[PDB]
């Protein structure tokens, strides 16, 4: 009820204080975990963007379909026998 | 009483648990900034490899080998919205 | 007289719960050491046959008995043996009865003509004998893109179905180029560009196409829309 119960309490609260506000503590966990969360989320979009361009490059050499889309979308070239139509507003 | 001595060891093993996962997360966050930097360098190099392959003088050279022909205005049907 | 009969009454009520407890304790030892052989399948089952669950359980070996058979090992074996099981939960009870709850995958389309996709993008496989009765759109794409192609199908389909078109197949490349297959084998060769804007161009240009198609007596083979405000049309003869 005395210092046998008060000294055991002042150490627990210094332990609770060092748990929340402390090196590698709870607040350090929450802050770092939020960073790791947003990082891999952003890196996921970046890797998706790079893998898509890698596929375009992998098809521009040793492949024709990605080259043929550029041959039509950017140079308006059509294959022989294809009736070309055009839309105007 | 000494029942708080139980609560001390409970919070002690809580601290070492948090300090381990945080130390494990900071090592992962440092790995992600290296991955982001490695992704951008790969992204920049890929764009430069696209300009070389997506060159119109190169595209027209291989598309004509694919038996294609430039857009001919007479053989062009027009439709109005 | 009272305590004399009370003690005798005490022993009688005592003796009768002992021997009766000796009976029910024997009624359980001869029951808790029998391999359970009653199973009940709760849940709406459309692909799982009753023999499917049976042969997949006894594939582990001897059935075991109560208090010696693990739940997490049975529900796991079901998930690998039957790839069309979304949720499984096996339960036991004091007698020889095995409650097994099943939740199946509802296919919305086919995935690379081998597996299938549900409405939430989950991928799964089913033997072809049990789904040949279903007409399903055939989706293609890279390995992990199961849900991404499904978003494209529901968006491009509702635009085509709005003008009474049936999107039979929808394929996406790893570079995110699109090839659509409609009814009667007409191919829409979209590209990495504005697929939503190029598809709306086709439903507006279509009535002009079939006119010259029947004028020259030709069937539409493909329609390449890898342009801007334009489209190249291929032709083919009819049988």
Author numbering:
A (entry chain B): 1 to 89
B (entry chain L): 39 to 119
C (entry chain Q): 22 to 260
What does the paper say about this structure?
The crystal structure of the FtsBLQ complex was determined at 3.1 Å resolution by molecular replacement using the partial structure of the complex as the input model, which contains the periplasmic domain of FtsQ and the C-terminal region of FtsB (PDB: 5Z2W18). The remaining atoms (~40%) were manually built, including three fully resolved transmembrane (TM) helices. The three proteins of the complex, in a stoichiometry of 1:1:1, meet at the C-terminal membrane-distal region and form an inverted V-shape conformation. One branch of the V-shape is a lengthy coiled-coil heterodimer FtsB-FtsL (FtsBL), which extends continuously from the inner membrane to the periplasmic, where their key functional domains locate. The other branch comes from FtsQ that adopts a rod-like shape, with two globular periplasmic domains arranged linearly and connected to the TM helix α1 in a slightly bent manner. The crossing point of the two branches, however, is not at the very tip but somewhere in the middle of the continuous FtsBL coiled coil, forming an included angle of ~37°, where an interface between FtsB and FtsQ is revealed. Therefore, the two rigid periplasmic branches of FtsBLQ form an obtuse triangle with the plane of the membrane (49 Å and 70 Å in length and at ~37° angle) and are connected to the bendable FtsQ-TM and the unbendable FtsBL-TM on each side. In Site I, a heterotrimeric β-sheet is revealed for the first time in the FtsBLQ complex, involving three C-terminal β-strands, FtsLE115–V118, FtsBE83–P88, FtsQS250–W256. The tightly bent short helix of FtsB-α3 is sandwiched by the short helix of FtsL-α2 and the β domain of FtsQ, forming an extensive hydrogen-bond/electrostatic interaction network which involves the FtsB-FtsQ interface near the C-terminus of the coiled coil. Therein, FtsBE56 serves as an interaction hot spot, bringing together the β8-β9 and β10-α6 linkers of FtsQ, the α3 helix of FtsB, the α2 helix of FtsL, and the C-terminal region of the coiled coil.
